[PDB]
Structures are given as structure tokens and as C-alpha cells.
């Protein structure tokens, strides 16, 4: 885990940019223009109250790290995430259609790129009269 | 395969007329048979539902194996239940286990009890087991576990304090009445179980009448805790019904929740993001248009970006409330001063 | 034609401190017939009631009937009930399909039982059916029926459980209680049918006494039940109770939503509206100032102006939300933004 | 005058420890003549308790007789109830006339009955009467009858349906009953009225046992009944208690309601400026710096500044809604949106 | 020093798998003897369960006043509890008391009644008293108090009205049935305390059917208060159960208020603050970067502070309300009117 | 009542200025600010909504006279003021001190002339104490 | 319903004036302006929003489409189309004055031409004591 | 108390500077940036509301002296500061960290100097492995 927390450092080392040893609200969003994307203060916000504990309004290193210790491959955020695909199931049987699945990814929410999602249906073996388990990706993307 | 699904909602997702129906007439035959059951007990009809009950039993056995292994094939539509393991999950849930026990034990009585006391003994009991197989996805016993537990402090407080005032109450009631004489000579009560019998069938306000108490102090007594604490078994009804009313009535309201939508959607495009940002030689990388140390920062960035998606995620299932408006109120208000301050700033 | 109305309202939409008399000392004479009804199955005065009965029924046949006709004729004031047929679908009407029941048969039991048992059979049975005259629109059994509908789910909850626990736990008494002898002599659990008239007199708190068990585990089983089923036999209450007095309270605090009149006139307004569009010499084609296909585009912008004034108005009749705040407020937000960037923008 | 308004505070504004003490005092001694009443009746202790209530009841009478002039003096604090005919006002009030009735009563049977039945008999029923004294403002009262007359179509509601459910249910019991024999050879079932009483009994789960149907018609119908019919007679439990909490939190929240002073004063303020318009000689002419007709138009915009002050204080007193949050959000809203475009138009 | 807040936890603050593994053993223990003393009233089983419950007696002496010692040295743990007189404090307490009884009663008689009636005698209320030693922390009775407390002008409206009805109803009842005699022979109403218990049991629906009416003026009074009075002694079970629900959900609830983390620091700084003023000398003064009245206006505003930081957290406790909505709307909105019209005006 | 009628018509006329036959929220502001008053368009609004009941947002003639129609001197209003006195009445006797009325009259709501006031106090028998019975003044000023 | 779709494709392409096969807020307000309407934003807005089923903010073709296909002459809309003229009903009774309702039709909500409501009474059986049976307009204007 | 009123009144010439007798929000705010503080007009709001029972939004000389009455050592604040403790206390057993209450003073709500809080620990007897008896502070600072 020091070699973990060493490039952790290093990671919170690109948002600190000084000895203050935290990130504000703006701290990040220059990081963020610096890649071209133009957030919304809100958006900014609303990121960043979900790593402090402290009530502050900015991340102190152990944050950061707790951030990067909790883990996606979770009870938790596996049923979450099947739960999401059930909204986009007709019929309730596990299984959802590809076309109707590209025209959601590439519509709704943010937006993708058509090559992302190209490679988001032949990760799954999308054969058998075009249906897809959607548990599937689950199990892919909760392997980590 | 769509006939597959078909049945399937036909028999375990019902909705409609047609499927109304079939199941109304299965409750009504299973009611049916249970009344001659009832009836076997009688002496004057002993003979008559008694040989009717060995018929009817051998129909409904070859009607209700034949459900069950129709339904075992058509849950094949659902993919938890696809292939061998999955029908096996399937036999494994509960209410399955009960129609197949039923079925079993029905075939067995009857191929070994043709030639037979124990038989309508067995009988009977499993005239009275069937009706669970009406409710078939359990949202009965589902919804009342759910209230039970939401409410469990309020109920354990109930049942401890209206424990402790029977106990007690009902010591002393013995003490007072111990040595009194009936009317017709008896004494009703001779000891503690007696006078906690009455305890329990007056707290509860059944009051059949078997005991009753003839001093002064035992009526004093008995008026006392008559008045003070029946209401203690008696408030689970108020807990209870104004639990399921307001689960119902939200879990109707959820319907109406349209916003979740895009909230799932941007919850599996930044999970399935986070997990591709782990292939280097991904297509994801081409969004931001060399790369020492980006790499990092993009994935910290998502991670997050993840992260405050799932909690919008889940909180747009949920009513709005107060503290939403406020907040919101609040944040709106604030960015709007220091707009208006920086356009102020501009000008000079 | 103002009379006509004016007496329908007396009759059918009562209000005031007449037509409350009126309508009070007909349900007060009918309530004394009806305990002339009572005491003519008494033998003392049997007699005395039962000649009674004889004058009163035609008072009331004549009396009765008059108010039928009156009513019937006077219902010509709603345009549903204009003309014959209307007057028929008057007729229809359940409450009046009673009330002619009610004065027929009585003319029908005078003309023939003059000259007389079943006779007075009926009679009783008529006095008792003239009950349902009082409430006129119903309004009672509509409260009742909406309530049962909206709390279905709940309700039959309940029942299905109650049932249940009911059936187990008198089978398994009946089996402590069979060969139990009474102090009388007599066996109190000969079948299972007598379980369970035990077990409905007692887990709905009523308790008669006709029936007690007397071994130990019996006590033991009807304590539990006792304790743990009565509730599901009492939630209904509560239940009901709400729903009524959340009906009432918010059907009464709809008088006072002003805002439906505007949206009432809108709907009506672009309604009428897209109809005329269907005639292209209207004069709704002046109020834009040739028109190769600027026809359709009207046509369609009118059909969603419609749409859009249909859902307005839908729930301008219905009480504000959290919802609608936030909905109110992100809108008129995000306006304001756009407002004071392009202000922002004009400045440069 | 500062001891007099002192005293009816301490008797009829009570609060403290010292007036509780006072009250409970008086409740005591009241219930406990009240057991000696009780006591009079049983034989053993007729004689006892009969001497006794002779001299008990002097004492009170000169005691509670002391009080009620006492207070009818005192009550010369309130401005309502000075002067004599203010006096007469109080004897007039319910309370006071229940007072004078209890006391003048036992003056008079103690000085007649001295030299002595019917005394007794009286006596008796004078001291249930007179726990009326204890609740002095009648908040118990008040708080009843406002919770009825709020809730009073659902209790009409109840009482209907459940009175017919009676009458109906109790006639079939009657023809299935009523040539049935009992165990011990009489006939409970004679008559209807019979039956009526078998049902209120029952529907309003007391259960006496003293008749109970043997046929399997009547323990069908009873049955089905006491299952469906018995809510009708609880639901008023779950209203009115709710109804009580209701009030009583809301009659305590409006104690931190803190708009409405300034809405009172401004309400009296523009009412007396309404009124001294009306002397043009009067002083709140100056307000305004000759005047043909600035009289009328000053008469106008006063008069419906009172009328929208009345209406602003009278929803001071009451608890904000969301309606008022939207309300008020559209005005302010709007007025922003004006305002910007104002500063808009004054740049160009 | 870990340890003995460790075990402190466990016995007095429990938690998890194993302490409620433990507090279940207790119960189920403490049950066990509490029905051989049941039995022991039991002329079959007088000598069984009387001689085990001389040895269990010893048993459990035992090992509660072990725990009740260890209790009472981790209770140091807590800096109320810490040295000699904190441990007093400990011991004052009402369950520690409760426990230390029933040890110390255990052993006296024990060491006594070795060589013993009142012996048992006393026993079997031990133990029966030993039933309360399961709440550690009442927080049952906790909540009760709380409840009746918030709701005890509702529950005396209750009490004060069924009484009445009780003792009007039965003094008219017993007008009416005291000559009366029964089928055997015998009078139920002799005296007016068998008419109230009579109401007693008829009006709280136990019906045990030891008294009842035989007369018409008896029936026709018991029926309509029956119908009428029952509802006051059923109210309080909704009233009760309401509450309890309320109280939970809210105080859970409670967990999730983030608000107050910064409003209790505030407070805390602000009150040193206020202290450190009064010493000259402090460093509190380096803040403000000579000094004739500085020192007065300084201490004047932060005493303001301290009363404004004081209600904050106060109120940043409870959950919010449209009040607050209103409040925060209209602040913000008369804020930024003025900061436009700054803005208006500084162009100008 | 046609004198009456002749007198509201006269008083419409000014407020009309027009032969529109309606008022509109800055007609009536105009009229206010000819007299040296400057209120707030909130304030005419809510003054102009206690007249009308078409929800249009302006005054029909039907509507002015109807406001004319409906009496101070009604069983409502009397109590309605009755009310607003016991706000400041300590000890709910029927009774308020004079200075504690004056205190309340010149600074709270709308603030009065001093000379009003002045005039207020000695329509009613303030002297006993410089006590003054309430209703006394409910009574006058609604004896129109 | 191919000479439907054709007649639907025409009159999609007024407003698409783009191979974008969209419309926008704007882009159905150029085409209003064109006519000499002049709507607000927040109008357009909530007319757009009751013809998609995106939550995108543009019509698609199928959408439009479906707001086409969907009939004037329902069951539903006939009974709220019904109930709007209960609120301008006095008695209740399915009548109501001539008068009433040209002053209702030419004042309140959408002004409208004294014309057009002068075509809109002839409509109806206007005599019989100046009453109409309004369920007979609501015949009329849902028969298509 | 003669003195005191003579130190009350001297302090209320500070604030009110003119023959006013009343201080408002800027006559308020004026004198704090004297001082270099720099306040918001919220602030100053909530600030003055907790001093009048008036309603008018100033302070009369009775409620100033009001507020200096009334004491700090009090049953009730005494309980609330000690309640304001119990939010940063792991465990509840009437102990706080040393660095934790540090971290605490320094960053949250009004951030106090270093010196300050290195004043404010030595107070109490710190040692002991580090813990501190919280109700100790509490009756020292409710000492006067
Ligand atoms: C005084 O404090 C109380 C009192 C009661 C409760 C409480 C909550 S849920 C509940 N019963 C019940 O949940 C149901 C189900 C579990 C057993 C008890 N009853 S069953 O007899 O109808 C019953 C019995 C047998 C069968 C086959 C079906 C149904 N009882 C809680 C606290
Ligand atoms: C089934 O439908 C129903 C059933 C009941 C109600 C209902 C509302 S309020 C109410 N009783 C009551 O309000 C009280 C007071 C009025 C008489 C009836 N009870 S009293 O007997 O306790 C009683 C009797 C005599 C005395 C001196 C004091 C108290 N009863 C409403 C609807
Ligand atoms: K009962
Ligand atoms: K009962
Ligand atoms: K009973
Ligand atoms: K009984």
C-alpha cells in the first residue's frame, strides 16, 4: 500500500499545485479546462461534497485517499447498477435489445461517442436475435 | 420462446381477465375441497365428503403437478432461471417448496392409504396448506415484514409493557380471590394460571365469562387495569394499518418518477467509462482531444464523477422534500450574487 | 320553469332549514313504522301494531308515491333528463328503481292480502327497505366504495392473513379439544366447524363463552392467536377512518382553487378553436394578419396548444406539491441566468 | 381592584401550584361524597354512610355556595361582566347556572327533608351532578364539539351504514332463530327486538352471551357480520382521537406565530383612520401636504387598505402552505424580471 | 482502561451479535424460573418446582449481583461515574436500585428461610420483579412518558368523559334494574357499585356476562351507550400508537442533520470567546489588528454572537419547515433587489 | 340609492380617466402618486385583488360598487377589530393602558401623525387610572 | 394512411426547414413570428414538451407523428371538454345564458373575435328563453 | 447598580452617537468596521434581532440593558454548550482528544488564532493520555 499512497500523492499532487495540501472548488475546475471540458459551478460542487467528511468545502489528502480506498467491485453498487438497466427493460426478463440500448447511450444523459459505444455492445455477445444479458456487463464491469 | 414468456405471465406475472380468473377458480376449488374437509369431521356427512375427498384429491394432484412443471420450464424467460442450476434456483424458492410438498404428500397418502386413519388425519392438514399457493410472489407477507420491521420498537415497547401489567395485575387478582367459592361451588381461581388466563382474555377484551372475580379488591383491581391497559394490545392495528397504507401509497407514487431516467443512464455511461478507462488501448481516451501523467487525473476525475452520479442516482427515486428546496434555494440564490457582483465588476 | 327547478332542489339538492325538516320527519315517521314493525312480533302487542300497520302503509303508499311523480316530472330541469327518454333515464337510477319497488309491492300486498301471513312477512321486510329512501345522491355509499377502492391492496391483506391464522389455529385446537368434556357434560369441540366459530367469535373480540377450551394447550394456542391475530381483524378501522376524512377534508378544500376558471376557459377556448380550424371559411384565420401551407402549421400548433391547456387545466384542480416548486423554481432560474448573460452579452 | 382580578384568576383563570392544589382539593372531596353515595346503597353500610351525607353535604353546600359568590363578585375584572347587568351575564353561563342549581337543590332538600326518601334519592343524583364543577372554561366540552361538527359527515357516514347492517343482518337472524329451542328449553330468539339487541351486542364487540344462534343460517349470517359490519362501530376511535391531536397542536403552534401583531395594528390603525375620515374637521387630513374632490378618492383607497389589511391579518394567524411559497415566488419572480428589463431598457 | 469501557459497552451500551446473545439468555433464563413459579402454585407440581426454585434462587444470586459488581466498576468509564461518590451516583440510580433489591431480598431470604411460607410467598414476586432488569436504559418507558406527556390534554378530555358517561349511565341503569330478578332467582343489580361495574366491563367491551339487563329501559340505555361511550376508552390506542411511530421516526431521523457539526464549533468558539474576554491579558484581543472603549462595544458584540450562534444551533437541531422556505426566500429576494439597484444606480 | 350610484359613478370617473370602464394597477398608482404617497406595485396588487371576482386583475364598475355596497358597521368586521385589540391587552380584562396604546399606534404597522393619536386617545374616557375600555371604541368606529 | 404519412412529412418539413429532421424552440418560433404571433419562450417550451417522449427538448418525426394519430374525439377529452363548462355553470343544470358566454368567450383566457363568437352562437339552437344546451356543442366540436 | 447602568449607558453612547437613543443596522455595522471586521448585512440582521422585543428592527436603551441583565452562567446555556460538546465526542463518555479538539477550533465554524487555542488547551490539565474532562471547561467558562 506505499507504493498505493505514493502514487496517490503524486495524483493529489496534479489538483494541489502548492503546499496547501487541498483542492477548491476552482483548484479543480482549472485542472478540468486545462483537458477542455467547461464544468458548471454546480458541477463542481455538487462533485466535490461527495469526498469531504469535514463540512469544509475542500478535500484534505486522507479524503483522497478514503475517495480512492472504497471500492467499486461492491455489494452495493452492483445492485444499483442492475437496478439502473431495469428502467430500459421491457418486460422484466433480464434481457434488453442492442439498437434500443445504442440509441440510450448515445442520447440520454451524457452523451457518448458512437466508436464508445461500437465497443460497449461487442464487449457482450450481443447474438441471439439481438437480445443481451445486461447481467452480464454487470458481472463484467464489477470484475475491476 | 415468446409463448415461454407468455405463459410465464400468464401463470406468475398475472395482469387482465383471463388470468383473474384462472386463478379465482383455483382459490374457489381449493375452497371447496377445504369445506368438505370441514364437513368429514361431522358425523352425519363422515361418509359422504370422506369418499368425495379421495376423488377430488387425485384431480387436483395431476392438476397441480402438471402447474407446477409447466411453470418449472417456463422459467426459462427470466435469466437468473436459464439453464439446469437456474430451474434448480427456482425449486429452491420458497413457495415452490410448498406446492411441491403438497403435491408429493397428496400422491403418497393416496398410493399407500388405498389400503387408512393417519391418511384423512394428513388430509385435512393439507386441505388447509394449499391456500398458500394463492399468493404467488408473496407481496402479502411481504409488505407486513416490511412494516413489522420499520416498527419494531414501537410494538416491542407494547408487548413488553402490556407483558409486565398482566403479570402483575394478575398476581394480585390471585392474592384477592384465591380462597373465593362460586356460586356453583368451584373456585375459578385455584392458581396463578388460571387468574394469567383471565389476564389475557381481558386485556385483550374477549371477556368470555368462565372467570370472573367476586371480591371488592379483585374488582377494583380488574376495573383498573381493565381501563389502563387494554389499549396496549390494541395499538399494533393503528401502527400496522397506517404503516401499509403509506407503503402502498408510495410505492404507487414511485410510478410517477420521471426524472431517474437520465440519472440511470449517466449512472452506467461513467461506470462503464471507469471500468474502460483500465484498457489503455481503449476508445475512451479519444473524448479528450502526449499523456505522462493524464492518465491519473482522467481516472480520478471519473471515479468521482461515478461517485456523484450513483448518490444523484439514488436519490431520484426518492420524494422531494424541504430540505431539497432549500438547498437548492440556497445554492441558486448564491450563484446568482456572484453573477450579478461579477458583471458589477466588469463594468468598472 | 324556475318552479320546476326550484322544487327539484327542495326534493334532490336539499339545502337549508326546510328542506332539512322535511326530509328529517320523513325518515322519523318511517323510523316509527318500523318499531311498529318491531313490536308486532311481539305477542302482547302483535294486535295493536299489526292494524296499526295496515292505516300507516297506505298513508304512506299515497305519500310516497306522490313524491315519486312530483320528483319525476320535476327532473326535467337537467338537460340529461329533458324529454321522455331523459325522464326514463331518470327511472333508471337505482335509487329510484327502489323507491318504485317499494311503492308498488306495498300497493300490490294492500290490494291482495286484504283478503294474509306472508302478508306481514313482507311488510316487515318493506319497513326495513324504506331505509335506503333517506339518502338521496348517495354520497354515503359512494365515500364507502371510493375508500375500499383506493385501500384495496390493504385490505385484502388483512383478510388473507386473519383467514389464515384462523384456520391453523382452530385445526390444531380442535385436535387439543376434541375428546374434551365439558363441566356440563357436554362437548363443547365435536367438530372442526365449531373451531371455527370459536376461533371468528374470538379473534374479533367478541367472546360469547358458548365456547372455551379447557386443556392446556389449547389455552396455550388461544392465547397466542388472541394476542397476535385480533389486530388484523381491527386495522380495517383505521383504515377507513383515514380515508374518509381525507376524502372529505380535501374535497372540501377544492372550493377554494381559484385558478381553474382561467384554465377551464383556456381549454374550452382552443378547443372550439381546433374545431373551426376544420372549416376554412372560418373566421378564426383572421385573427393571423396567401396560405399555401401555413394551414397544416397552424392546425398543429393549435392541437398542442390544446394539449398543452388540457394537462394545465388537469391539474389546476388539484393541490400544489413540493414538486411544482422545484419544477418553478429550476425553470424561472434558469430563465433569470439567460436573462442576465444576454444582458451581459449587450453590454459588449 | 388588582386583588380582585387576582382572585378570579386564582378561581377561574387557574395555573400554578398553588390553584392545582386548590382544584385537585375540590375534586377530591367531591369524589369521595360521591363513594359515600355509592356506599349508601348497600345494605351493610346504609346507615354509616346515610348519617354521614347529612353533614358532608352541609359543609359543601356553605362551601361551594361561598365560592360562587365569591367569583360573581370578582368577575368585575372582566369588562364584560361589570356593572350589574355584567353580573347577571355571569350568572347566566351554563357552569354557573349548574353551580347555583347544585347548591340551592341541597339547600333546600337539607331544610325540607330534614323532617325523607325521595331526599335520599335526590342526594344521590346531586353528587354525580356535581363533577360538572370541576372543568371550568369547558375546553373538554369545546374540544369535543369541534371535532364533531369538523367531522361530522363521516360520523353520519358511519352511524347510517352500520344501523342497517344491524337491522338488515338481525331481521335474517330472527327467521332463521326463531322457533330454535335452547340447551336449557327457552326460546332467546322470540322476537325482533330480541334480535336487535343480539346485534348491537354484538357489532360493537361486547358479547354478553346471554343470546347466541344455534342454526348454521344464523352463525353465517353472524359470521359474516361480525367480520364486515363491526369496523363501522370504531372508526369515531380513530377520528375523533386524531381530530383531538390535531387541534391541540395546532391551537399551541399558533402561540409562535409573531407576523400578526404588526397586521393587528395595522388593521386597527387604518380602521380608526377609516372612521375619523369621516370628520373632515378631523387631524388626519394633514397626512396629505385646496381639496374639492381629493375627499372621495381618500375615502377609497382607505377604505380598501382596511379591507386588505383585514384580510392579511386574518391569514397572519394562520400557518404558511405551499401555495403561499409559489404565490409568492411567481410575484417576486415577475417583479425581478421587470426590474431587469428596466435596467435593460435604461442602458439603450 | 479500554477494557472497562469495553465491558461497559457490553453490559450497559449493547451492540451487535454477542451482547443481545447475552441480554436474550437473561430473558430467557429469568422466564424460565418465573414459570416454575407459576407451577409452583400448582398443587400437582408444589414440590418440583419448589425445590428448583430453591437452587436456581441460588444460582442466580449469584451471578446478578457479580454482574451488578462489575457493572458498577466500569461504569468509571463515564466522567459522571468517575471516583467514589460517581459510583454513588450509579447506585442512586432507579434500575440499579431495582437490582440491588432484588439481590439483597434474594439472599435474606434465602439465608433465612432455609429453617418458610412467606417465603415463598415473596419469591414468586421477586420473581415476577425481576422482569425489569431487561431494559437497561428504559427507553421504553422513556418513550411512554414522553408520549403521554405531549398528549395529556387529549387523554384527560378521555378519561373525563367516559367516567361521565359511566357514572350517569349505570345510576340510570340501576334505576331501572334494581327490583329486577334473574332466570335463577337471584338479583345482579342490587346496588349502584354493581351497576358501575357493569359499565365498566360493557363500555372498555370485555362483556363478561355476569350482569345484564333484563328490562327495556334497561336495554334501550345500555344500547345507546354502547354505541355512544365505548370510543372514549379506544381513542388513546391511536393517540398512543401515533405517537410512538412519530417519536421514533423523527429521532432517527435526527441522524442524518450534518447542519449541526458547524453550528455546535460556533458555539463552543463563541462562548470561549465571551470568557476570554474578560481577562485582559488573553490573546483574544490580537484578533483586532489604543484601547480606551474598545473593550465595551468588543464584549457587547460578542455577547450578540454567542445569542445569535445560541439559537442557530438550537435551531439547526430540528428539521426544517416552509416557515424557514419563506423566511430564506424573502431575505434573499430584498437582498438582491438592493444589490441590483446598487448596480442601477452605480451606472448612473 | 341613484344619488348613490350617481356619487360611485362620479368616483369611478376618476380613477377611469378613460372610457375604458376599468382600473388597471398603474391607473390607481397614478392617482396614489397625485397625492404624495408612493406605494409598491405589490401593495396595488394585493389592494386590487380584494375588489374584484373575475380574476381578470382589473376593477369592473359592477365590482367598485359592490366594494361600495358591503358595510363597516357588520357582525364580522366588529369582531374581526375586537380581536386585533387583545393582541396588547395583558391580562384579557377588556382593558389597555394609554401610553402602552399610544406606543402601539405610533410605531408599529403603519406609523400614525402624532395629532392623530392625539385626537384618538380622547374620544374615549381615558381618565380611571388611564385605563380605556376597548369595545368602547369598537362601538364608535363601528357606529359609522 | 400513406397519403397521412405524406401529408405529415410535408407538414414536418415547414418546421424542419433542415435536413436536421428536428425542431427546436426557435425553430418553431421563426415560423409563429412568421405569422405575426409573437409567442414567449416559457410558451413554447411547454407546447414542445407535449409532443415528446425524449425528454431531449425536439420533436422527432415519429413523435409528431404520434401527437397526429392520436384522436380529438375521445373519450377523455370529451369529459374534460365538459367539465370546463360546469365552472361557468350556475345551477348546475346544463344550461347556461348566451349573454354569459359571449362575455366569457371575449374576456377571459384567449380573447377572441367578436365574429368568431358571433359564428360560435349560431352554432347552437340559441332560442328558448337565450339558454343553450352545452353537451350539444360538446357533441359538435367532437364529432371531427 | 447605579454603576452598572452609568458603564451601560457610557456603552450605548458608543453605538448610538447621536441623541437617537436607538441603534440601527448600519449604525451598528459602522462601528464593527471600525474595528476591521467586516460584517455582512444578514449578519447584522440576526444579530439585532436577538437583543428587541419591539418588532421595529432597533434596539431601545431598556432592551440593551435587557440583554446585559440577563446571565451567561445559567442553568440552560450551561447545558447547551455542554450538548454542543457531545457532537464531537466518539463514545460519549465525557472525554475529548487534545488534537482533535485542536483540528476542531481552528478549522470549523469561526476558525480561531493558533494562540488562542494554544491558551485554550492549557487551561484544563491535558495530560493523561491526552484526553480532557469537557465538563471541566464547561464550569470554568460558566464560572464568570
Ligand atoms: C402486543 O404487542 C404486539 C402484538 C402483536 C404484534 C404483531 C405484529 S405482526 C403480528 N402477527 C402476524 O404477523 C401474523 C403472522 C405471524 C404469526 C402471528 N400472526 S397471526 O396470528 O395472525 C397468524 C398465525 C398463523 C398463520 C399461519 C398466519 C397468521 N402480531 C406486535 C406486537
Ligand atoms: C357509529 O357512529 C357513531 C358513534 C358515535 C359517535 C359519537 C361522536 S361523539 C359521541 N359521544 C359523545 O359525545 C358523548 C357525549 C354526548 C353523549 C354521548 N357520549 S357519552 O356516551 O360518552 C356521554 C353520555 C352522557 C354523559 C353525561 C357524558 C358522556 N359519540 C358518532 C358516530
Ligand atoms: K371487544
Ligand atoms: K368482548
Ligand atoms: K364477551
Ligand atoms: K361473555
Same mark, same amino acid.
Given at each position: 500500500?506505499?507504493?498505493?499512497?505514493?502514487?496517490?500523492?503524486?495524483?493529489?499532487?496534479?489538483?494541489?499545485?502548492?503546499?496547501?495540501?487541498?483542492?477548491?472548488?476552482?483548484?479543480?475546475?482549472?485542472?478540468?479546462?486545462?483537458?477542455?471540458?467547461?464544468?458548471?459551478?454546480?458541477?463542481?460542487?455538487?462533485?466535490?461534497?461527495?469526498?469531504?467528511?469535514?463540512?469544509?468545502?475542500?478535500?484534505?489528502?486522507?479524503?483522497?485517499?478514503?475517495?480512492?480506498?472504497?471500492?467499486?467491485?461492491?455489494?452495493?453498487?452492483?445492485?444499483? *447498477?442492475?437496478?439502473?438497466?431495469?428502467?430500459?427493460?421491457?418486460?422484466?426478463?433480464?434481457?434488453?435489445?442492442?439498437?434500443?440500448?445504442?440509441?440510450?447511450?448515445?442520447?440520454?444523459?451524457?452523451?457518448?461517442?458512437?466508436?464508445?459505444?461500437?465497443?460497449?455492445?461487442?464487449?457482450?455477445? *450481443?447474438?441471439?436475435?439481438?437480445?443481451?444479458?445486461?447481467?452480464?456487463?454487470?458481472?463484467?464491469?464489477?470484475?475491476? | 420462446?415468446?409463448?415461454?414468456?407468455?405463459?410465464?405471465?400468464?401463470?406468475?406475472?398475472?395482469?387482465?381477465?383471463?388470468?383473474?380468473?384462472?386463478?379465482?377458480?383455483?382459490? =374457489?376449488?381449493?375452497?371447496?375441497?377445504? $369445506?368438505?374437509?370441514?364437513?368429514?369431521?361431522?358425523?352425519?356427512?363422515?361418509?359422504?365428503?370422506?369418499?368425495?375427498?379421495?376423488?377430488?384429491?387425485?384431480?387436483?394432484?395431476?392438476?397441480?403437478?402438471?402447474?407446477?412443471?409447466?411453470?418449472?420450464?417456463?422459467?426459462?424467460?427470466?435469466?437468473?432461471?436459464?439453464?439446469?442450476?437456474?430451474?434448480?434456483?427456482?425449486?429452491?424458492?420458497?413457495?415452490?417448496?410448498?406446492?411441491?410438498?403438497?403435491?408429493?404428500?397428496?400422491?403418497?397418502?393416496?398410493?399407500?392409504?388405498?389400503?387408512?386413519?393417519?391418511?384423512?388425519?394428513?388430509?385435512?392438514?393439507?386441505? $388447509?396448506?394449499?391456500? =398458500?399457493?394463492?399468493?404467488?410472489?408473496?407481496?402479502?407477507?411481504?409488505?407486513?415484514?416490511?412494516?413489522?420491521?420499520?416498527?419494531?420498537?414501537?410494538?416491542?415497547?407494547?408487548?413488553? $409493557?402490556?407483558?409486565?401489567?398482566?403479570?402483575?395485575?394478575?398476581?394480585?387478582?390471585?392474592?384477592?380471590?384465591?380462597?373465593?367459592?362460586?356460586?356453583?361451588?368451584?373456585?375459578?381461581?385455584?392458581?396463578?394460571?388460571?387468574?394469567?388466563?383471565?389476564?389475557?382474555?381481558?386485556?385483550?377484551? $374477549?371477556?368470555?365469562?368462565?372467570?370472573?372475580?367476586?371480591?371488592?379488591?379483585?374488582?377494583?383491581?380488574?376495573?383498573?387495569?381493565?381501563?389502563?391497559?387494554?389499549?396496549?394490545?390494541?395499538?399494533?392495528?393503528?401502527?400496522?394499518?397506517?404503516?401499509?397504507?403509506?407503503?402502498?401509497?408510495?410505492?404507487?407514487?414511485?410510478?410517477?418518477?420521471?426524472?431517474?431516467?437520465?440519472?440511470?443512464?449517466?449512472?452506467?455511461?461513467?461506470?462503464?467509462?471507469?471500468?474502460?478507462?483500465?484498457?489503455?488501448?481503449?476508445?475512451?481516451?479519444?473524448?479528450?482531444?502526449?499523456?505522462?501523467?493524464?492518465?491519473?487525473?482522467?481516472?480520478?476525475?471519473?471515479?468521482?464523477?461515478?461517485?456523484?452520479?450513483?448518490?444523484?442516482?439514488?436519490?431520484?427515486?426518492?420524494?422531494?422534500?424541504?430540505?431539497?428546496?432549500?438547498?437548492?434555494?440556497?445554492?441558486?440564490?448564491?450563484?446568482?450574487?456572484?453573477?450579478?457582483?461579477?458583471?458589477?465588476?466588469? =463594468?468598472?
Amino acid at each position: 500500500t506505499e507504493e498505493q499512497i505514493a502514487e496517490f500523492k503524486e495524483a493529489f499532487s496534479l489538483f494541489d499545485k502548492d503546499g496547501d495540501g487541498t483542492i477548491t472548488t476552482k483548484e479543480l475546475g482549472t485542472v478540468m479546462r486545462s483537458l477542455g471540458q467547461n464544468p458548471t459551478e454546480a458541477e463542481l460542487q455538487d462533485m466535490i461534497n461527495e469526498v469531504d467528511a469535514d463540512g469544509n468545502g475542500t478535500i484534505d489528502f486522507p479524503e483522497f485517499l478514503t475517495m480512492m480506498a472504497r471500492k467499486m467491485k461492491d455489494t452495493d453498487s452492483e445492485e444499483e *447498477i442492475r437496478e439502473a438497466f431495469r428502467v430500459f427493460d421491457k418486460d422484466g426478463n433480464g434481457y434488453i435489445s442492442a439498437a434500443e440500448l445504442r440509441h440510450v447511450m448515445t442520447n440520454l444523459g451524457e452523451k457518448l461517442t458512437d466508436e464508445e459505444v461500437d465497443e460497449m455492445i461487442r464487449e457482450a455477445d *450481443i447474438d441471439g436475435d439481438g437480445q443481451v444479458n445486461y447481467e452480464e456487463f454487470v458481472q463484467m464491469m464489477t470484475a475491476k | 420462446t415468446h409463448v415461454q414468456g407468455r405463459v410465464y405471465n400468464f401463470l406468475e406475472r398475472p395482469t387482465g381477465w383471463k388470468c383473474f380468473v384462472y386463478h379465482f377458480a383455483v382459490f =374457489l376449488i381449493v375452497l371447496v375441497c377445504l $369445506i368438505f374437509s370441514v364437513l368429514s369431521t361431522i358425523e352425519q356427512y363422515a361418509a359422504l365428503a370422506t369418499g368425495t375427498l379421495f376423488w377430488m384429491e387425485i384431480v387436483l394432484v395431476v392438476f397441480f403437478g402438471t402447474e407446477y412443471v409447466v411453470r418449472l420450464w417456463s422459467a426459462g424467460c427470466r435469466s437468473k432461471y436459464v439453464g439446469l442450476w437456474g430451474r434448480l434456483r427456482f425449486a429452491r424458492k420458497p413457495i415452490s417448496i410448498i406446492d411441491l410438498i403438497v403435491v408429493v404428500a397428496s400422491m403418497v397418502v393416496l398410493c399407500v392409504g388405498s389400503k387408512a386413519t393417519s391418511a384423512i388425519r394428513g388430509i385435512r392438514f393439507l386441505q $388447509i396448506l394449499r391456500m =398458500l399457493h394463492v399468493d404467488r410472489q408473496g407481496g402479502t407477507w411481504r409488505l407486513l415484514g416490511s412494516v413489522v420491521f420499520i416498527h419494531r420498537q414501537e410494538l416491542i415497547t407494547t408487548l413488553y $409493557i402490556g407483558f409486565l401489567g398482566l403479570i402483575f395485575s394478575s398476581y394480585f387478582v390471585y392474592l384477592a380471590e384465591k380462597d373465593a367459592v362460586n356460586e356453583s361451588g368451584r373456585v375459578e381461581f385455584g392458581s396463578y394460571a388460571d387468574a394469567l388466563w383471565w389476564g389475557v382474555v381481558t386485556v385483550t377484551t $374477549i371477556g368470555y365469562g368462565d372467570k370472573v372475580p367476586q371480591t371488592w379488591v379483585g374488582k377494583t383491581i380488574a376495573s383498573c387495569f381493565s381501563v389502563f391497559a387494554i389499549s396496549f394490545f390494541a395499538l399494533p392495528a393503528g401502527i400496522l394499518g397506517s404503516g401499509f397504507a403509506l407503503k402502498v401509497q408510495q410505492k404507487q407514487r414511485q410510478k410517477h418518477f420521471n426524472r431517474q431516467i437520465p440519472a440511470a443512464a449517466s449512472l452506467i455511461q461513467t461506470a462503464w467509462r471507469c471500468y474502460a478507462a483500465e484498457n489503455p488501448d481503449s476508445s475512451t481516451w479519444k473524448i479528450y482531444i502526449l499523456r505522462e501523467h493524464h492518465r491519473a487525473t482522467i481516472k480520478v476525475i471519473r471515479r468521482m464523477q461515478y461517485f456523484v452520479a450513483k448518490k444523484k442516482f439514488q436519490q431520484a427515486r426518492k420524494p422531494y422534500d424541504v430540505r431539497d428546496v432549500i438547498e437548492q434555494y440556497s445554492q441558486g440564490h448564491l450563484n446568482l450574487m456572484v453573477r450579478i457582483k461579477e458583471l458589477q465588476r466588469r =463594468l468598472d
